[PDB]
Design a protein around this ligand. Structure first.
Ligand SMILES: Nc1nc2c(ncn2[C@@H]2O[C@H](COP(=O)(O)OP(=O)(O)OP(=O)(O)O)[C@@H](O)[C@H]2O)c(=O)[nH]1
Ligand SMILES: Nc1nc2c(ncn2[C@@H]2O[C@H](COP(=O)(O)OP(=O)(O)OP(=O)(O)O)[C@@H](O)[C@H]2O)c(=O)[nH]1
Ligand SMILES: COc1cc2c(c(OC)c1OC)-c1ccc(OC)c(=O)cc1[C@@H](NC(=O)CS)CC2
Ligand SMILES: COc1cc2c(c(OC)c1OC)-c1ccc(OC)c(=O)cc1[C@@H](NC(=O)CS)CC2
Ligand SMILES: Nc1nc2c(ncn2[C@@H]2O[C@H](COP(=O)(O)OP(=O)(O)O)[C@@H](O)[C@H]2O)c(=O)[nH]1
Ligand SMILES: Nc1nc2c(ncn2[C@@H]2O[C@H](COP(=O)(O)OP(=O)(O)O)[C@@H](O)[C@H]2O)c(=O)[nH]1
Lengths: 426, 438, 121, 428, 426
C-alpha cells in the first residue's frame, strides 16, 4: 500500500511544510535532489510518502489547498519550497473566510473540484492505495471547512480506502478570533462521521508545553509548531520505515479503535524543544517512558487520569535495547495498571525503530486512544454552547446559507460522543 | 505417496521458507537445485521425493505453494538465495493486505485470490500419482493466516475429499508481537477450520520464545530465531514420511495413532536437545536423558503442563544414532520416576520411531550439531489449557463487542462470532470431558 | 473222555468229524434314503451359499455407503460455503452502498440548501 | 463252488495284498501267473496267468498303487483294482453317503463281471477296517447292496477291530458302531480281529519291539489262510460258506467267532520245533494267544471248532482233546452239545520266506463263538457313549448328510446285541 | 490331495518368506534350482507345497498379497526371492491402511479379485485340491482385513475344500499402535465363522519366549519370527513328507476339532532360538516331551493348567526310537493325566518323522486344541471392550463405511466363544 496527502489551510499548510521538511530530512532529500545519506535504509518504504518522477529526483505525494494565495508562496518561497510539483498547488484566489460555512459551502465548493481531481490523479496514479492523510486547523475556515468537505467527498470516490487527519483543535490563548468553537464543533461533527483515525493535537497543550515546561517566553507560531512536526514524524515512522513489521494504517486503525466512532488519539512525544536549551542526550528509556506517559507531555490538554486508556501504542527511536524497553513499558501498566481499560487485553503495543529523528539520539512517540480525551470535547462544546446560548456570532453562518438547526444537530452530536466516551468507564 | 506444503500468512510463509531450507540441508540441495546424490529426476524413484518433484534435468523444486495477500514476505523468497529454488508460480502474492482480520481473508480480499491459488495447488498434485494430502502452515491469529487459511481449507476438503489435512498453527503468545484483535481471529478460524482439518500441531510461541531465552541464550529471541527452532520440530514431525527406512514410516498412521475422536485433536510436540554452539562440544547426550528432558513442562511446545491433565496418546519420534534396546529400558525408566497420567482407556502408549538420519541443523544457526534427537507427539487434555487462556481473552473483549464492527463491516454476521465461541464452548467441555475418568 | 465222535467226510486232501463230549442237555427300492443324503447336503450347503451370498453384497454395499456418506459431504457444508460466502456480498453491498447513500445526502442538503444564497442582500 | 474276495479300505487292502500273497505261496503261483480243487479262489486266464477272484477298492490311490507297483503288479487285471480320487477322510458319513455313492456302481459292476464267469458262486469274503473312513462307510454301502443283487450267497466279514495304540484316531468308535449296526443284517458270519491281540502276539512270540504294519498282516493272513483253506484245497469241517454259519452261528445275529492261530514262533527258533500235537492245541486254548482282547474263561462257549493243518492223524487230536478238557475251564453254555467239529488238512502250513514266522510241521486254528466276544462290544461302546454324551464329533457327519437319529438308534441296537449276547449266555 | 498358499500382509508375508525358505531347505531347492540333497525322500509329497514347472526347476504353490508394494520387493530382493512366479505377486499400490475396515472393505475389495482370480488359476490348475492355507497378522490391516476377506470369498468358490490359517494374534509389548484389538476382535469374529482350523500364534508368547527363556535382549522382528517359521515346519511335516500315514488336512481337522467352532490350536515347539547349546544336541526325548508340554514353550500365551486339552497331537523329528517316544508320551497323560478332557478317548495322538529340520538332531512340535486358549481371547476381548468402552479410536472405522454395531455383534461373538470354551470344562 501507499498514502497521499492533503494539506489545507494557513495552519494545515505550515503544519505540513514543517512536516515534510523533517521527513524529507530523514530519508534525505535536497530541495528536489535525490538522496544523500550514508545510512542505506530510508528508501525502503519511501514509496509510501513519495511518488518518484523525472531523473533521479524525488517529489512528495502531496497536494496543497488554500482559498487565498498567500500561504502557498509561503511554502514555495520558504524551506523545502522547490520540492512540490506545481499542479499539486491548488490556491483558491477568492477570500479564505475563516468561517467554516465559507469553506464548506460557498468559497469551498467553489474550488473543491480542482483539488478533488488532482487527488484523483496522484492517487489513481500510485501503484495501489492505502488511504489519505490530511492536515488542518479544526477552527477558522478553509481547511476546517474546505477540508472536512474534501474527506466527505473523498469518501465516496474512495470508500474502501481509509482515513487520517491531523486536526489542530483550537484554544483561546494563542489566536483569539471570536468564532473558533463554532467551526470546531462543526468539524468535530464532520470528522466523527467519516474518518477512522484522527490525531487530536490541541493548541492549549501545544502552547502550555512550550511554556511551563520549555522556557519559551512568548511562544511563536513556529518554535511551537515544531512540536507537531516532530510528533507526526514518530506517528508515521512505522509505516515510513523498517521491516520490523509493516503498517497498513488499517492494521493501525482496526487495532487502535475498538468503536466505530474514530476515537481521536491524543498523541505525545518524548524529548522536546531546544535550540538554546537541548544538550541532554542522557534521555534514558526509563526516563524516556514515564515522560511519555506524562500529563503535560501529551499533545492533547487532557491528563489520562480522568480517563482510562482504551488502547495505546508507542514508537521508539534510536540504537537502544528492548531488553530495557520491553521491561520498562511492562512496568508502566503496573505502577499505573489502574488507568487502563480492564477488558481489552494486550491494549498496549510498542515498537522500536533504530533511526533517530532530527537531532536526538533517543526519542519516543505516543498514540493514545483514551476516554479522557472527551476533556478536550467537553471543553469546546461548552465554549460553543455558551455562544450558541444567546445564538451568538452566528449571523455570520446564518446568511452564508445554513440552517438554524445544523448547529444543534452537531452540538447534539459532539455532546453525544461526550457521553459514550464517558459511557466507557465500565 | 506424495505431499504438498501450502504456506499462508506472514508467519506461515516465513516458517515455510526457513523450514524448507532445513529440508534442503538434509537431502543436500544447494539452492541452485541439483543434489549430485544418486539419480531421481532421470527417473524419480528415490524415497526423498516425498515432498519434491524432480524438474527438467538439474533443479529439484518443492511441492509447495506460498500464498500471502501482501508482497513483502514472499518477495523475501524471490530475493534471498533460494530465489533459485521455486517456479515463480508457486509463489502467490496478492496486492492489498488482510489487515489483521478473519473478516478480510475469508470474505472480502480473500475471495479474490483463492481461485488462483486453488489452481496451482491442483497443477502440483496433478503431477503426482497418488497424492496423500496436505500440510497447511498458518498463523493462528492475524489476517490472512486465519482468514484465507479457513477459506482455503473449506475448499480443499471439497476439491479433494479423501486426502487428509495437517495444520501447523502458530498459537500467539502475548509478548512475541500479537495484536489486540487476535483472540477473535484465532477463535473465528479455528471454529470454521476444525471440521475440515484431520490433525493439528499447535505451536505456542511463548513456549518457543521461552526455549530460546532458556537454552539458546538469546536476550532478544529473533523472528527468524524462533523459526529455526520450529523448523526443526517440523522437520522431525515430517521426516518419517520423507527419506525412509525399515526403522519407521508415515504419520498416515501416526494419526490413527494420535487422535481418537473426530475433533482434530491437537497434538503437542517437544523437540529434544536444543543446545547452543558455544556448547557443540559438551554433547553426545544421554539416550535416556534426551527422552527424559523432553518429558518436561519447561521444554514444551504449548504453554501448559501435562502433569495436571491426563494423556490419551504418546508417540516418540527419534532421530540419529539410536537402536531400540535403549529407548526400551529407558522408557520403563521414563515410566517409574514420573507422573504417568494415562486416561482410563488408552493403553499406555509410545509407538516410537527411530530414523537414523543425522539431525542436521542450520550452519549459520545457533543450535549445534547433534548425535541424536527426540520429538514426542503426545495428545493430552491439558492442551485444553491453551483453549481458554485464549477463550478468556476472547470473552471479555466480546463482552463489550470490542472490535466487532471491523468485521461486521467487511461483511460478517454477529451470530458467526456468537455461534463460533459457542463451539469452543463445546470443545473445551468435550476435552476436559473425555478426560480423567471413573 | 468216553467220548465217541461220529465221522464226517473224507477228501483227497482232508477229513472232518464231530467229537461231542457230554450231552447237549432285505429289499432295496430303499436307496431313497441315499438321495436324501444330498437333499440335506446340497441344502445345508446351498444355504451356506445363501447365508454367505449375503456376507457378500453387503461388502459391495458398506464401502458403497461411505462413498454415499462422503458424496453427501461435498453435499452439505461444501456448498454451505457458496451461500454463506454470498451471505457476504448480500451483507456488505448493504453496509457499503449504504455508507455511500448517506455520504450522498450531504450532497442534496449541501446543494439545494446552498442555492440559498438565492437570498442575498 | 467259487469265492470272491472284496477288499475295501486301507487296512482291508493291505491285509488282502499280503494275504493273497500267502495264497500264491501255497498253490505255487509265481507273480507272473503260471503254476507249472485249487481254482476255489482263482479263475484260469488265457493260457499262463492264474489271476484271483478279487476286487480291491479304495477311495484314495496310494494303497492300491503300491499293488500296481510291487511285484504282484503282474497278478491282477488292472480292472480288479478300483481307486477313487478323493479320500473318505475317516468317517462313515463320507464312505456311505457322499463320496461313496460315486464309485459304488462301478465296483458293483466288476464284482458281477467276476462272479459272472463262475458257474455257481457261493459267496463273498469282505475284508475291511472296523473303524475309519471307507473301511466302515463304503463297506456298509457295499454290503447293503450285495445282499440285494445276490440274495442267497452268504457273506463273511473279516473286520479289523481297532485297538488304542496301533494307530486309531479319536472318531473311530463312532465309525465301527455306525457300520456294524447297518452292516449286521446283511452279513452272515464275521471274523473280528482285534489289533491289540495281534500286536501283542507280535511283541510276545515274534519278539518285535516295533510291530510293523505289514508285520501284523503276515500274522493275520495266516489266520485268514487257515480260516479259508478248508474250501480252497477242499476237505470238510466247512467245504462251503453256508457251512460256516451252520457250525459257528446259532442265532441270526451274525455271530462273531474269535479265532486263535496255533504256533507262532520266530525263525531264529525255526529249529527248536516239531511242536506237541497236543500242545499246539493246548496253547491255542489260551487267553494269551487270542485274536480279540477278551477272555473266554469269564463267559460261556456256544460253538467250538478246531481247524488243523499239516501232518496230523485224528487218533491224536482225539485223546488230546479229552486232555484239553480235564485240566481246563470247559464252559459250554447249557444247550450247545460239547462241540469241537475238527478238520485236519494235511497241507504244510506254508509261511512267507521274507517273513518272521518260520516253517511249521503242523498248526491249529480254533474258531470259537463265545459270549465273551461281548466284552469287545462294550470296550468299544464305552468309548462311543461318553464321546456321544457330548456330541463330540457328531457334526462332521451331520454335515456330510447324516441324521442324528442314525447315531442314536444304531447305538440303541448294540444296546440290544450286548444284551442279546450276555443274555443267551450262561443259564438255569 | 494338494494345498495352495495365500500369504497376505507385512506380517503374513515375512511369516511365509521365512516359512518357504525353511521348507524349501528341507526338500532342498536352490533359488529356483532343482533338488540337491543326497537323502532321497523329499520329493515324495512335494506335490503338496510345490507345483513344478519349466525345466527341472520348482516354484512354490504360493500367492502373495499386499496393499502396498514395499513388503513384496522384500521377498524378491531378499532370501529365496527368485523362487515365486511373478504373477503370483499381487501388490496393491494404494495405502495399506492398517485398519481392518480399509482392508476388508475400501482398499480391500479394490484388489480382492486379482488375488482371488490367481488363486483360481493355481488351484483349479493343481491335480486335485486339498484346502488353502493363509498366513497373516490378526491385527493391523491388509491381511488381518484383506485376508479374512479372501477366505470369506474362497468359501463359496471353494466350499467343500477346507481351511487353514496361521494368524498372529497381536499384543501390546512388541508393536504399539493404539488400534490392534479392534482389528483382532473383528477378525476373531471372521475366522470363527469360516475356517475349520487356525493356529493361534500369539506375539505375547513369541516375545516372552525370546526373552525370559532365550537371552535375546531386545528381540528383533527376525530373530523371533524364526520361531513361527520353525513352528509351521513341524505343523506341516506329516502332510509334507513320509508314508507313515498321510494327512488330508481334513483327516487332521475332523480329529483335532470336536466342535464346529474351529477351535484354534495353540502350538508349541521343542528346541528353540540359537547356535550354541540346544545346538549341543543332547535334547533327549524325555527332556524333549516335558518341554513341549510346557507352559513357557507354547506359541500362545496361555498355560494349559487353566484349561484341559480337548485333543492334542505331536510330531517328532529325527532318527530316534518310539520304543522311547510311545512310552514317554503315555507318561505325560499320567504325571499330568488330570488336565486332559475325560470324555474324548485317544485324544492324544503322535507321529514320528525321521528327517530333522534346519540344524537340530532332535525336535518336536505341538498342536493344542485346549480350552485354556480362551485366555488369549478373554485377553484381546477386554483390551477391546475397554476401548469400545468410550467408543474409542473407532471414528476411524466409523467413517470408512461400517456400522456402529458390527463392532458389537463381533464383540458379542468372541465374548461368546469365550464361554463355550469356558463351557467345556464339564
Ligand atoms: N512463529 C512465528 N510467528 C510469527 C511470525 N511472524 C508473525 N508471527 C505471529 O503470527 C501471528 C500473526 O499472523 P500474520 O500471518 O502475520 O498476519 P496475516 O494477516 O495472516 O499475514 P499478514 O498480511 O502478513 O499480516 C502473530 O501471533 C505473530 O506473533 C514468524 O515468523 N514466526
Ligand atoms: N491290521 C491292520 N490294521 C490297519 C492297517 N492299516 C490301517 N489299519 C487299521 O484300520 C483303522 C483305519 O482304517 P483305514 O482302512 O485306514 O480307513 P479308510 O478310510 O477305509 O482307509 P483310507 O482310505 O486310507 O482313509 C485303524 O484303526 C487302524 O488300526 C493294517 O495294515 N493292518
Ligand atoms: C507506524 O505504524 C504502525 C502500525 C501499526 C501499529 C502501530 O502502533 C505502534 C504503528 O505505529 C504508529 C499497531 C497498533 C496497535 C496495536 O494496539 C495498540 C497493535 O497491537 C499493533 C500495531 C502494529 N503492530 C503489529 O502488528 C505488531 S505489534 C500493526 C499496525
Ligand atoms: C498335518 O499332518 C497330520 C495329519 C493328521 C494328524 C497329524 O498329527 C497331528 C498330523 O501331523 C502334523 C493326526 C492327528 C490327530 C489326531 O487326533 C489327536 C489323530 O488321531 C490322527 C492324526 C493323523 N494320523 C492318524 O490318524 C494315524 S494315528 C491324521 C491327521
Ligand atoms: N498550532 C498550530 N495552529 C495554527 C497554526 N496556524 C494557525 N493555527 C490555528 O488554526 C486556527 C485557524 O486556522 P487557519 O489555518 O489560520 O485558517 P484557514 O486558512 O481559514 O483554515 C487558529 O486556532 C490558530 O491558532 C499553526 O501554525 N500551528
Ligand atoms: N511376529 C510377526 N508379527 C508381525 C510382523 N510384522 C507385524 N507383526 C504383528 O502384526 C501386527 C501388525 O500387522 P501388520 O501385518 O504389520 O499390518 P498389515 O500389513 O496391514 O497386515 C502387530 O501386532 C505386530 O506385532 C512380523 O513379521 N512377524
Amino acid at each position: 500500500r501507499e498514502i497521499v496527502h492533503i494539506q489545507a489551510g494557513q495552519c494545515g499548510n505550515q503544519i505540513g511544510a514543517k512536516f515534510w521538511e523533517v521527513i524529507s530530512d530523514e530519508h534525505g532529500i535536497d530541495p528536489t535532489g535525490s538522496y544523500h545519506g550514508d545510512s542505506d535504509l530510508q528508501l525502503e518504504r519511501i514509496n509510501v510518502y513519495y511518488n518518484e518522477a523525472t531523473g533521479n529526483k524525488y517529489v512528495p505525494r502531496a497536494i496543497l489547498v488554500d482559498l487565498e494565495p498567500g500561504t502557498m508562496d509561503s511554502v514555495r518561497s520558504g524551506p523545502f519550497g522547490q520540492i512540490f510539483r506545481p499542479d499539486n498547488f491548488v490556491f483558491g484566489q477568492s477570500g479564505a473566510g475563516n468561517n467554516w460555512a465559507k469553506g464548506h459551502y460557498t468559497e469551498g465548493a467553489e474550488l473543491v473540484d480542482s483539488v478533488l481531481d488532482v487527488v484523483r490523479k496522484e492517487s489513481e496514479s500510485c501503484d495501489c492505495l492505502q488511504g489519505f492523510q490530511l492536515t488542518h486547523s479544526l477552527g477558522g475556515g478553509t481547511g476546517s471547512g474546505m477540508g472536512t468537505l474534501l474527506i466527505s467527498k473523498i469518501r465516496e470516490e474512495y470508500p474502501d480506502r481509509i482515513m487520517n487527519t491531523f486536526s489542530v483543535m483550537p484554544s483561546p490563548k494563542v489566536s483569539d478570533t471570536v468564532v473558533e468553537p463554532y467551526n470546531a464543533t462543526l468539524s468535530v461533527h464532520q470528522l466523527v462521521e467519516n474518518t477512522d483515525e484522527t490525531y487530536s493535537i490541541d493548541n492549549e497543550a501545544l502552547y502550555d508545553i512550550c511554556f511551563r515546561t520549555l522556557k519559551l517566553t512568548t511562544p511563536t507560531y513556529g518554535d511551537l509548531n515544531h512540536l507537531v512536526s516532530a510528533t507526526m514524524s514518530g506517528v508515521t515512522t512505522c509505516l515510513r520505515f523498517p521491516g520490523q513489521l509493516n503498517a497498513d494504517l488499517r492494521k493501525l486503525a482496526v487495532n487502535m479503535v475498538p468503536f466505530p466512532r474514530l476515537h481521536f488519539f491524543m498523541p505525545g512525544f518524548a524529548p522536546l524543544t531546544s535550540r538554546g536549551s537541548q544538550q541532554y542526550r542522557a534521555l534514558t528509556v526509563p526516563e524516556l517512558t514515564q515522560q511519555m506517559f506524562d500529563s503535560k507531555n501529551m499533545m492533547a490538554a487532557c491528563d489520562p487520569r480522568h480517563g482510562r486508556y482504551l488502547t495505546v501504542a508507542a514508537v521508539f527511536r534510536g540504537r537502544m535495547s528492548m531488553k530495557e524497553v520491553d521491561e520498562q513499558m511492562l512496568n508502566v501498566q503496573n505502577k499505573n495498571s489502574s488507568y487502563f481499560v480492564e477488558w481489552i487485553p494486550n491494549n498496549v503495543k510498542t515498537a522500536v525503530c533504530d533511526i533517530p529523528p532530527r537531532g536526538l539520539k533517543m526519542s519516543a512517540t505516543f498514540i493514545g486512544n483514551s476516554t479522557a480525551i472527551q476533556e478536550l470535547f467537553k471543553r469546546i462544546s461548552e465554549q460553543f454552547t455558551a455562544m450558541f446560548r444567546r445564538k451568538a456570532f452566528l449571523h455570520w453562518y446564518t446568511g452564508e446559507g445554513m440552517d438554524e438547526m445544523e448547529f444543534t444537530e452537531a452540538e447534539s452530536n459532539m455532546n453525544d460522543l461526550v457521553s459514550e466516551y464517558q459511557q466507557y468507564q465500565d | 505417496r506424495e505431499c504438498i506444503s501450502i504456506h499462508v500468512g506472514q508467519a506461515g510463509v516465513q516458517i515455510g521458507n526457513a523450514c524448507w531450507e532445513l529440508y534442503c540441508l538434509e537431502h543436500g540441495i544447494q539452492p541452485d537445485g541439483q543434489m549430485p546424490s544418486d539419480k531421481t529426476i532421470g527417473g524419480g524413484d528415490d524415497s526423498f521425493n516425498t515432498f519434491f518433484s524432480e524438474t527438467g534435468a538439474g533443479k529439484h523444486v518443492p511441492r509447495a505453494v506460498f500464498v500471502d495477500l501482501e508482497p513483502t514476505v514472499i518477495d523475501e523468497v524471490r530475493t534471498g538465495t533460494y530465489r533459485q529454488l521455486f517456479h515463480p508460480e508457486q509463489l502467490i502474492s496478492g496486492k492489498e493486505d488482510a489487515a489483521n482480520n478473519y473478516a478480510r481473508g475469508h470474505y472480502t480480499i480473500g475471495k479474490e485470490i483463492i481461485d488462483l491459488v486453488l489452481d496451482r495447488v491442483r497443477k502440483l498434485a496433478d503431477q503426482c500419482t497418488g497424492l496423500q494430502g496436505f500440510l497447511v502452515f498458518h498463523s493462528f491469529g492475524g489476517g490472512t493466516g486465519s482468514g484465507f487459511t479457513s477459506l482455503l481449507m473449506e475448499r480443499l476438503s471439497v476439491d479433494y475429499g479423501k486426502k487428509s489435512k495437517l495444520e501447523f498453527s502458530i498459537y500467539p503468545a502475548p509478548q512475541v508481537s500479537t495484536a489486540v484483535v487476535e483472540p477473535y481471529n484465532s477463535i473465528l478460524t479455528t471454529h470454521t477450520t476444525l471440521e475440515h482439518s484431520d490433525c493439528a500441531f499447535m505451536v505456542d510461541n511463548e513456549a518457543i520464545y521461552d526455549i530460546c531465552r532458556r537454552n539458546l541464550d538469546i536476550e532478544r529471541p529473533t523472528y527468524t530465531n524462533l523459526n529455526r527452532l520450529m523448523s526443526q520440530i517440523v522437520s522431525s514431525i515430517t521426516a518419517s514420511l520423507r527419506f525412509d527406512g525399515a526403522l519407521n514410516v508415515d504419520l498416515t498412521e501416526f494419526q490413527t495413532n494420535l487422535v481418537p475422536y473426530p475433533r482434530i485433536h491437537f497434538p503437542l510436540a517437544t523437540y529434544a536437545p536444543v543446545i547452543s554452539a558455544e556448547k557443540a562440544y559438551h554433547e553426545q547426550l544421554s539416550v535416556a536423558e534426551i527422552t527424559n528432558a523432553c518429558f518436561e513442562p519447561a521444554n514444551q511446545m504449548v504453554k501448559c503442563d501435562p502433569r495436571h491433565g491426563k494423556y490419551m496418546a504418546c508417540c516418540l519420534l527419534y532421530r540419529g544414532d539410536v537402536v531400540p534396546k535403549d529407548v526400551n529400558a529407558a522408557i520403563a525408566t521414563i515410566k517409574t520416576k514420573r507422573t504417568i497420567q494415562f486416561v482410563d482407556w488408552c493403553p499406555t502408549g509410545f509407538k516410537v520411531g527411530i530414523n537414523y538420519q543425522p539431525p542436521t541443523v542450520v550452519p549459520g544457526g545457533d543450535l549445534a550439531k547433534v548425535q541424536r534427537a527426540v520429538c514426542m507427539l503426545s495428545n493430552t487434555t491439558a492442551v485444553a489449557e491453551a483453549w481458554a487462556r485464549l477463550d478468556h481473552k476472547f470473552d471479555l473483549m466480546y463482552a463489550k463487542r470490542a472490535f466487532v464492527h471491523w468485521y461486521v463491516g467487511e461483511g460478517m454476521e454477529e451470530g458467526e462470532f456468537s455461534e463460533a465461541r459457542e463451539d469452543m464452548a463445546a470443545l473445551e467441555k468435550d476435552y476436559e470431558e473425555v478426560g480423567a475418568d471413573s | 473222555a468216553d467220548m465217541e465222535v461220529i465221522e464226517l467226510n473224507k477228501c483227497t486232501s482232508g477229513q472232518s468229524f464231530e467229537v461231542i463230549l457230554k450231552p447237549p442237555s432285505s429289499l432295496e427300492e430303499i436307496q431313497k434314503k441315499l438321495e436324501a443324503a444330498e437333499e440335506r447336503r446340497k441344502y445345508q450347503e446351498a444355504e451356506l451359499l445363501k447365508h454367505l451370498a449375503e456376507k457378500r453384497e453387503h461388502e459391495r454395499e458398506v464401502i458403497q455407503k461411505a462413498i454415499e456418506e462422503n458424496n453427501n459431504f461435498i453435499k452439505m457444508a461444501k456448498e454451505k460455503l457458496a451461500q454463506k460466502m454470498e451471505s457476504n456480498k448480500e451483507n456488505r453491498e448493504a453496509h457499503l452502498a449504504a455508507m455511500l447513500e448517506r455520504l450522498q445526502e450531504k450532497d442534496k442538503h449541501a446543494e439545494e440548501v446552498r442555492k440559498n444564497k438565492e437570498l442575498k442582500e
